[PDB]
Amino acid sequence: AQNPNCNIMIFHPTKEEFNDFDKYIAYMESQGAHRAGLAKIIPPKEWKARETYDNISEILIATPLQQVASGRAGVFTQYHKKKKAMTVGEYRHLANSKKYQTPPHQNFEDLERKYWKNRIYNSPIYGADISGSLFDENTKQWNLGHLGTIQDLLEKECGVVIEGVNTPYLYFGMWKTTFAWHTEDMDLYSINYLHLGEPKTWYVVPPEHGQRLERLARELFPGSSRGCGAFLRHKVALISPTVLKENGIPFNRITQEAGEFMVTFPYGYHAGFNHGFNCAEAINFATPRWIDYGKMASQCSCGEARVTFSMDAFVRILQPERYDLWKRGQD
């Protein structure tokens, strides 16, 4: 069995190996990369996402989100307070202001320590979930707006034709902006490219151990757990590495830098934070190996998780027994 300790693997494809996206994912899995839940892909030196980032300041962040925490430093939830619209140039200036800027630090480890000590005492503002792309249309390799769609994968594997679309999303971050513990919708893959700026630190639980994380989360968030049998789908709970280690939960960590891709694999729980002003692009995708995970994915039916249009068909076809309850949660 390849990668039996479930370590995060780092890949360096050549320019030739960068041509066929599906083939390279399958190669990484042949080497056991999925067992970690997360892999890093460093593009060949010949590749570029676009020519420059000099002209992005006029993108609008229609609904910036202020991430307000509650709890203790290692075990907290966050809620998202909506703020007035602002441009990427305005958001960059805000990220760099004395109130929000990254503190002085020695190295990534010192900054990680400072994050976990102090996150709860601040409320950073995240420009998340913005439909759009920063890949040049002429970039033919690993262009996250030109991937094979999940609807086409389902149709190729299962024969059923379904409605829905699959487009990328931009994330503009600042120091301490936080992504809570989650798997993807329908336990899909994700791919994330860090276009510019400061790093993103990731934490991940191997898919084979995801239920250990779920059981801890039920213990640590007991009111939330009573409210919903899949409350991690709400994407609000944080648990620190120190608390994970105290409770014996297997996990790994890695820091993504500008120019690097990360892939999350089906049912790989992940969480993390941004080091300073940055911009990432991400999208969900599927492969043949996903189908069995989609069929078994948990679902939130309490009303909180509310998701895209395109998840309807995935539930309807892969999980017909759950469909009626889940759709009530949507309505």
Ligand X SMILES: O=C(O)CNC(=O)C(=O)O
Binding residues: 126, 182, 184, 192, 200, 228, 234-235, 270, 300, 302
Contact 310, 166 (CB under 8 A): yes
For residue 264, list its beta bridge partners: 38, 190
- Which residues in 159-178 contact ligand X (CB under 6 A)? 171
- Which residues in 286-305 contact Zn ion (CB under 5 A)? 300, 302, 304
**How far is Cα 152 from Cα 148, in angstroms, rounded to an integer?**
7
Q: Is 282 in the site for ligand X (CB under 6 A)?
A: yes
Instruction: Please report how close the Cβ of residue 102 comes to Ni ion at its closest, in angstroms.
Output: 23
Distances, alpha carbon 319 to alpha carbons 17, 52, 230, 323, in Å = 36, 44, 16, 6
Contacts of 49 by beta carbon, 8 Å cutoff, 6+ apart: 134, 135, 136, 139, 143, 193, 195
Contact 323, 315 (CB under 8 A): yes
**Residue 58 binds which of ligand X, Mg ion, Zn ion, none (CB < 5-8 A, kind-dependent):** Mg ion
Among 20, 42, 279, residue whose Cα is nearest residue 171: 279
Structure tokens at 117: 């000590």
- Which residues in 29-88 contact Mg ion (CB under 5 A)? 56, 58
Q: Tell me the residue type at 43.
A: P
Q: Is 115 in the site for ligand X (CB under 6 A)?
A: no
* 176: DSSP letter: T
Tell me whether residue 152 or residue 304 sits nearer to Zn ion (CB atom). Answer: 304
Report phi then psi at 55, rounded to 5.
-120, 30
Site string for Ni ion, 186-215 (x = CB under 5 A): ----x-------------------------
Report phi then psi at 224, rounded to 5.
-65, -40
Q: Based on the number of CB atoms within 10 Å of its own CB, is 75 exposed (0-12), middle (13-18) or buried (19 or more)?
A: middle
Instruction: Please report how close the Cβ of residue 179 comes to ligand X at its closest, in angstroms.
Output: 4
Q: Is 17 in the site for Zn ion (CB under 5 A)?
A: no
**Residue 299 binds which of Mg ion, Ni ion, Zn ion, none (CB < 5-8 A, kind-dependent):** none
Report phi then psi at 172, rounded to 5.
-105, 120
Q: Which residues belong to the annotated binding site for Fe cation?
A: 182, 184, 270
Of residues 9, 153, 239, 280, which one binds ligand X by CB under 6 A?
280
Of 65-73, 166-174, 182-190, 302-310, the segment contacting Ni ion by CB under 5 A is 182-190
Quick one: which H or E segment has residue 323?
helix 320-330
**Residue 188 binds which of Zn ion, Mg ion, Ni ion, none (CB < 5-8 A, kind-dependent):** none
Report phi then psi at 330, rounded to 5.
-65, -25
Instruction: Please report how close the Cβ of residue 256 comes to ligand X at its closest, in angstroms.
Output: 9
Tell me whether residue 196 or residue 317 sits nearer to ligand X (CB atom). Answer: 196
- Which residues in 189-228 contact Zn ion (CB under 5 A)? 228
Tell me whether residue 16 or residue 58 sits nearer to Mg ion (CB atom). Answer: 58
**How far is Cα 231 from Cα 220, in angstroms, rounded to an integer?**
12
- Footprint on this chain of ligand X (rule: CB under 6 A): 171, 179, 190, 192, 264, 270, 280, 282
- Footprint on this chain of Ni ion (rule: CB under 5 A): 190
- Footprint on this chain of Zn ion (rule: CB under 5 A): 228, 300, 302, 304
- Footprint on this chain of Mg ion (rule: CB under 5 A): 56, 58
